[PDB]
RNA sequence: CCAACGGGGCCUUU
């Protein structure tokens, strides 16, 4: 993925799964991204801030999908006492 | 006395500790019986954090079952007229070489004498009083063993504060990481 | 599995992690010597012997207790028998059977059971052979089974 | 009728990796399964494990990060001359630039590329990529 | 379900398994101290006694066996040990 | 100089 002379000769490189690490196919259409706003100390919404997250299509097919991003945005500041590790 | 409650009197550390018996023994007509017969065979000291050092006493083998009728209250004598050191009693043991392909035979080695059995007895003898009640071995991404040794909560009180004495004399008689925990 | 049937059965003892004696029992290992010896002599295998320790005394593995297996301890003391007795009671129940059917030549049912517990003595006989436990050139047989138990 | 522990081992860590699981449980442990784990730590496929003892041939737990493709056993353990090696990296790997072929040599468990720089050689293993 | 804690289950859940299955095996039987209504004599029973453990001092019977736990009898006391 | 990869000797109950 780089030739001899240290050049990039990829033509892109994919996004990977925030749950799985899986590499997201340019045709995995069940694929999605989410985006979190950002809040302000006022307690309102920033335009243009986002913290995010990538699923792709096997896991929300097999409906891990919601628990998955519970543990994720756990980790985060973004949720309080909603999963458990045991 | 001295010469004849030390199985060898080299050296005056001893010779301190070994008083420490003789006197004991007197304070109390109790421990004129127990102590009389029991001896040691040698002493070091091992330095740890916060300045404080152990005081690991070696015993011969046939006879620790003798001490542990009167490891408590000696430890808290021994504490007292040493002050600032931890005291702890350890059987001496042997360990034979494995034998190499190319070694000429010898009477097959007993399985007590395996470097792995002695180890495992050096770490039960340290927390006398308790019990091992499990162990765990991570192997960490950097390429490095810990080991996890749980105790029994029962009259921990004895040892609680000595932990981390006894993490420093493991690691110098075998350059083994161990931490300990206590599970409710 | 079973050795001989399609059975599938995981029931068995568990014993304790701790491999010293509980802090509740206090005789001593020469008391407890003493009990296997005295049971010995009224004629006990180890297998019952074990049973009236654990649940008539404290006295919860004896090899926990004392240094040593039931076993090893009777043999000290020439208390062996001639024949290890999960042999004997192979033996002594291919005997039972085997009368049962001098009445009773129609039961094919038990015909059938009888080559199995055979089939097992001679896989058992010829470990003991291998350990060298029994004498080589002992053989099983059905006419002389009956005294050698009796 | 367990004939090879080994096998067992790798193919529980196969399974939890597709189906997409942080973590896996292996019974029992050896010191062989040890052995072949440091390896895959070492080049990055697994994270940290850790052995429990039981007085009964112990268990391990470890930590997956989504890395691993394929691990697998080779049986019988073919004896491997050095001439040899090449054949072997060709019919199971899948590129000439990565993967390994796990030997046991008198001079240890090795992966293929550290048996060359020592010129050792001994019988295969298995294989990881 | 995909993330999980394997090495620090939850005590309640754990106390509900099979003895074979838990992280460790081990015995949940235990030994009782027994005594007879005439004697001061204490006795040491096993919870899943097979035998019909009488008396020290004399041929009175403390429990029976059944398919699990042994049955004591009636007016013996107890204290689980 | 310095980094990697290979190798020998000695001590640690040997």
Same mark, same amino acid.
């Given at each position: 993925m780089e030739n001899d002379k240290g050049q990039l000769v990829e033509l892109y490189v994919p996004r990977k799964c925030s749950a799985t690490n899986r590499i997201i196919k340019a045709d995995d259409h069940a694929s999605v991204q989410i985006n979190v706003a950002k809040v302000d100390e006022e307690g309102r919404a920033i335009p243009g801030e986002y913290v995010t997250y990538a699923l792709s299509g096997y896991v929300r097919s097999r409906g891990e999908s919601d628990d998955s991003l519970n543990r994720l945005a756990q980790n985060d500041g973004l949720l309080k006492n909603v999963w458990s590790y045991s | 006395p001295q010469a004849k409650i030390l199985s060898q009197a080299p050296t005056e550390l001893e010779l301190q500790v070994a008083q420490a018996f003789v006197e004991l023994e007197n304070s109390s007509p109790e421990?004129?019986?127990?102590?009389?017969?029991? =001896?040691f065979k040698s002493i070091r000291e091992i330095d740890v954090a916060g300045g404080?050092?152990?005081?690991?006493?070696?015993?011969?083998?046939?006879? $620790?079952?003798?001490?542990? !009728?009167?490891?408590?209250?000696?430890? +808290?004598?021994?504490?007292? !007229?040493?002050?600032?050191?931890?005291?702890?009693?350890?059987?001496?043991? /042997?360990?034979l070489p494995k034998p190499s392909r190319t070694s000429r035979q010898v009477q097959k080695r007993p399985r007590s004498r395996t470097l792995t059995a002695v180890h495992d007895k050096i770490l039960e003898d340290l927390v006398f009083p308790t019990e091992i009640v499990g162990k765990r071995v991570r192997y960490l991404v950097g390429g490095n063993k810990i080991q996890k040794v749980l105790l029994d909560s029962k009259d921990v009180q004895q040892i609680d504060y000595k932990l981390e004495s006894f993490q420093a004399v493991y690691n110098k008689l075998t350059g083994k990481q161990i931490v300990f925990e206590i599970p409710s | 599995g079973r050795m001989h049937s399609a059975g599938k059965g995981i029931s068995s003892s568990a014993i304790p992690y701790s491999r010293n004696a509980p802090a509740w029992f206090k005789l001593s290992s020469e008391s407890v010597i003493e009990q296997i010896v005295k049971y010995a002599r009224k004629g006990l295998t180890p297998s019952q012997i074990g049973v009236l320790?654990?649940?008539?005394?404290?006295?919860? =593995?004896?090899?926990?207790?004392?240094? %040593?297996?039931?076993?090893?301890?009777?043999?000290? %003391?020439?208390?062996?028998?001639?024949?290890?007795?999960?042999?004997?009671?192979?033996?002594?129940?291919?005997? &039972?059977? +085997?009368?049962?059917?001098?009445? %009773?030549?129609?039961?094919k049912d038990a015909k059938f059971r009888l080559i199995l517990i055979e089939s097992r003595?001679?896989?058992?006989? /010829? *470990?003991? /052979?291998?350990?060298?436990?029994?004498?080589?050139?002992?053989?099983?047989?059905?006419?002389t089974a009956s005294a050698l138990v009796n | 009728t367990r004939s090879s522990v080994l096998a067992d081992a790798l193919n529980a860590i196969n399974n939890a990796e597709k189906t997409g699981k942080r973590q896996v449980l292996i019974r029992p442990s050896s010191k062989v399964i040890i052995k072949f784990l440091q390896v895959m730590q070492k080049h990055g496929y697994i994270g940290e494990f850790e052995y429990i003892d039981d007085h009964r041939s112990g268990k391990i737990v470890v930590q997956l990060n989504g890395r691993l493709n394929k691990c697998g056993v080779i049986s019988p353990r073919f004896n491997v001359k050095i001439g040899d090696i090449e054949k072997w990296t060709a019919n199971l790997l899948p590129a000439r630039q990565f993967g390994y072929v796990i030997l046991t040599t008198s001079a240890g468990?090795?992966?293929?590329?550290?048996?060359?720089? !020592?010129?050792?050689?001994?019988?295969?293993?298995?294989?990881? *990529? | 379900v995909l993330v999980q804690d394997l090495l620090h289950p939850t005590a309640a859940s754990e106390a509900r398994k099979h003895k074979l299955k838990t992280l460790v095996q081990?015995? /949940?039987? *235990?030994? $009782?101290?027994? !005594?007879?209504?005439?004697?001061?004599?204490?006795?040491?029973?096993? &919870?899943?006694?097979?035998?019909?453990?009488?008396?020290? &001092?004399?041929?009175?019977?403390?429990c029976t066996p059944t398919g699990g736990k042994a049955k004591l009898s009636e007016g013996t006391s107890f204290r689980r040990k």
């Open positions: - | 421990l004129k019986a127990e102590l009389r017969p029991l =001896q404080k050092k152990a005081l690991a006493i070696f015993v011969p083998v046939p006879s $620790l079952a003798g001490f542990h !009728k009167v490891q408590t209250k000696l430890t +808290r004598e021994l504490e007292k !007229k040493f002050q600032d050191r931890h005291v702890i009693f350890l059987a001496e043991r /042997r360990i | 320790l654990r649940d008539a005394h404290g006295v919860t =593995q004896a090899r926990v207790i004392t240094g %040593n297996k039931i076993m090893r301890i009777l043999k000290s %003391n020439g208390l062996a028998p001639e024949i290890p007795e999960d042999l004997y009671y192979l033996i002594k129940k291919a005997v &039972s059977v +085997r009368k049962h059917l001098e009445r %009773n030549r129609k039961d003595i001679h896989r058992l006989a /010829r *470990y003991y /052979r291998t350990v060298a436990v029994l004498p080589p050139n002992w053989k099983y047989e059905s006419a | 468990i090795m992966d293929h590329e550290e048996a060359r720089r !020592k010129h050792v050689s001994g019988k295969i293993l298995g294989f990881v *990529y | 081990g015995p /949940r039987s *235990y030994f $009782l101290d027994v !005594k007879c209504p005439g004697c001061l004599n204490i006795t040491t029973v096993f &919870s899943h006694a097979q035998t019909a453990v009488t008396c020290e &001092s004399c041929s009175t019977i403390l």
